[PDB]
Amino acid sequence: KTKFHALMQEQIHNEFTAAQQYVAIAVYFDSEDLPQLAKHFYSQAVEERNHAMMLVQHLLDRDLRVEIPGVDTVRNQFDRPREALALALDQERTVTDQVGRLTAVARDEGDFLGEQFMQWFLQEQIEEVALMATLVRVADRAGANLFELENFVAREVDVASGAPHAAGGRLG
Amino acid sequence: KTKFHALMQEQIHNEFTAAQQYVAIAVYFDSEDLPQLAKHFYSQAVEERNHAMMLVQHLLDRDLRVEIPGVDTVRNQFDRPREALALALDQERTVTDQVGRLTAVARDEGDFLGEQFMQWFLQEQIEEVALMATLVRVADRAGANLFELENFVAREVDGAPHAAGGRLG
Amino acid sequence: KTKFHALMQEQIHNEFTAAQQYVAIAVYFDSEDLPQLAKHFYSQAVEERNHAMMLVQHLLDRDLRVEIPGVDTVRNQFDRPREALALALDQERTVTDQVGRLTAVARDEGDFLGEQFMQWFLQEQIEEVALMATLVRVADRAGANLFELENFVAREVDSGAPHAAGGRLG
Amino acid sequence: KTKFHALMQEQIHNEFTAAQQYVAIAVYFDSEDLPQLAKHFYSQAVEERNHAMMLVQHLLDRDLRVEIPGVDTVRNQFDRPREALALALDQERTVTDQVGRLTAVARDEGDFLGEQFMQWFLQEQIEEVALMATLVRVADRAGANLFELENFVAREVDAPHAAGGRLG
Amino acid sequence: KTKFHALMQEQIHNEFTAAQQYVAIAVYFDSEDLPQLAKHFYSQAVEERNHAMMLVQHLLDRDLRVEIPGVDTVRNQFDRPREALALALDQERTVTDQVGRLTAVARDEGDFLGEQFMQWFLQEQIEEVALMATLVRVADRAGANLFELENFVAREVDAPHAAGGRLG
Amino acid sequence: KTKFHALMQEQIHNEFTAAQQYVAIAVYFDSEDLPQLAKHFYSQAVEERNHAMMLVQHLLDRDLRVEIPGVDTVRNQFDRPREALALALDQERTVTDQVGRLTAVARDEGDFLGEQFMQWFLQEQIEEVALMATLVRVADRAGANLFELENFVAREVDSGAPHAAGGRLG
Prior knowledge:
part of a larger assembly, 6 chains, mainly alpha, 5 helices, 74% helix, Ferritin-like_diiron (chain A), metal-binding (chain A), oxidoreductase (chain A), ferric iron binding (chain A), iron (chain A)
């Protein structure tokens, strides 16, 4: 078993866990009656699931063994919205590290196929982190006037022939 | 914390796990190059996620605490397609029991809202079990000419409470 | 063999027989030259057949043995339309009883699947009885001026239903 | 009561029974997970009901007494699909005989209206028997590969007034 | 007179009174120049009227005597919007209890028709309480900036036969 | 509190009660299986509610206090249709008097806004009374056949209006 292969298997687990964490954050917001934030995070959980499934599909394409893993417990309690957003930013930053390490490991093993495959993920991370950071600054500026944060999301947020195929198709 | 509330929380965990198990089965089929079976199980995983999210939505609606749980490890290794279909059938039968027990518990506690909410799930389980049982009998009849099972799926296999986050296709 | 399962098998028989009884009533009306009544009862016979086929489908879905039964003789002779409408009302009340007893029996055996499946039939019975009752009161008011009853049917008369085996017929 | 009238009343009974037998066969196939065969037999049962109602209509048209009868028990158990198809073929052959005899009897009593009315049923029988026979030969050739029989049905298997209108 | 029947008659009265209470709240909001809240409650009053009329229709369908009742006085004075929303939430919770008790009573008398008929009202209550609870929390968060509550309603906010048809 | 203002408040009560009385009549008809009559009275109850809500709107527009009132018990028992129609006619005549008196009272107090606002209601009463009177004469003539009264309603019985609080319902 190569390291890239082992590390990809870990990343599938990390991605499924990340997606579950977004669902928890979506449901937190929902229960706080912040529907624009909730709708955004429900959507973000579906996209992380898609990333996970792109990693599965890569191993499938290469005839490398792949396990659909279990998922670790995720955080459900937040003192307030800014704390959930902060967690989401931190998570995207963590994923950025993981993806960079996947690249480095493939480079080091001369796994050229793995290396090129990681490139799309690096670009996505650029923009995902940029978005989470934006949501954190805006939540900070909004303070307890959460309505402004909601208004910002409704207007400014969410309004790639490139992507790798996701096993089972890319969900909306 | 009522028993119905505790048991709903368990069910959400059971459903997310069931959904993960379907993804495993979908991926097994995909690796076996049985795309029609794979596509069907990917779709079934999305629906189970939906059921999970309908349970979440019910607790939300009632202002009862709800936790999005972790997910237990699921089975990835099968000797052959029929074995994965058998596991799916057994799973749907298990979910049917769990749903019956949720209803019973709500009846016993006089939770009339919980009881009526379970009804839709009972109907769905009727048809989901019938479908899984059909796939198993057809897989048996197809023996190792799996192509016939694929053809059957392509040709013959093609209201609800709100799901938190909306019902996914 | 559970009691619910046995009782569902009887109900299938009862529904096929109910459907045959509506055909006899439709034909009686047809022969009396009351085409609006006749058309409505032909339609009602198709719907009862559909109910029977929904019960069949339920057993099929659950892998429980199901027999397509024979049908008992039904009534063909009526002194007059009001007597046929009265028979139809009584029949729908009888079916209501049967459906309630199926529900009770499933509750009593903890057959949760069976119980939920009966619910749709209970709401249908509510409206079917209301309609038969209406036709009887209107026939009573019309007396021998059956034309008014025909006029009433032409002007005034006519979901998540469970799957019917073979599809729901019009 | 003429013999043609009596025999028409029997035929109405025979046809209601035949229709119920097709439903039994349709449900057998359905439970065996043979949906193409099932769908075809559900459809066949509706058409036999239609035939029965055409007979009812004919007596109605002639002001001859007509009873909607009860229906005899029908067969629900089959060892296998071929056995159900064989039963259906035999049944259509039996109906052909019955229809021939209705014709003969009307000829013999000088019931010209009855005789002409039977002619349509004679032509229908020709094709219905041909179809049942075809399904039996194809089921024989398919042996236990019932999927081929289903495939055949999906691809190759696509009037006097009926009291109450002709049902689809 | 069964208890279920007597209790349905009371529920018709309760529903008419509930509907009139929503009109009072709608008019309160209107006078406060909170048109989004007012429009929502006007629409809510029409829906409660619809519920009332579904209960009437059920008794009609069953040939059980039904009276269109009078309506009790309802509350018109509120110190502020959150107090009117609170009353609406309380009222929806109360209706939920009433509906549960209607179900229990029908179960206890073996009134299977009445029991199945109450089921739809249970599901509606689930969502109607969730919505009122949502409006109360949002009004709390908005405090005196009622404009935010209005903006929230404008953007985020918005069956058995009813005697006389379901009104919009 | 002016007399016009007080009397408008009473009128809002009278209108809500009138609307409730039409629902009672509609339901009586419905239970008698006279659907055309029933449909017409359901519709008439919705219109009276509208009138009520136009009065509410007028007080809203003028910043005068307005209470949504309770509703008095109304009549549910009728020996026969003609008796319910008679009650509706008498009710519309009573409302006509009430509206006249509101106008008079506004004239007497120099309430020019109230006076002009009452005018539309006077015109409506003209036609509503004419229609109720028509239904009564037709019901009298159709004593042997009430289906004729139904037929008449289906065929012969299906403006610059003031805003109704909450909008005018159909």
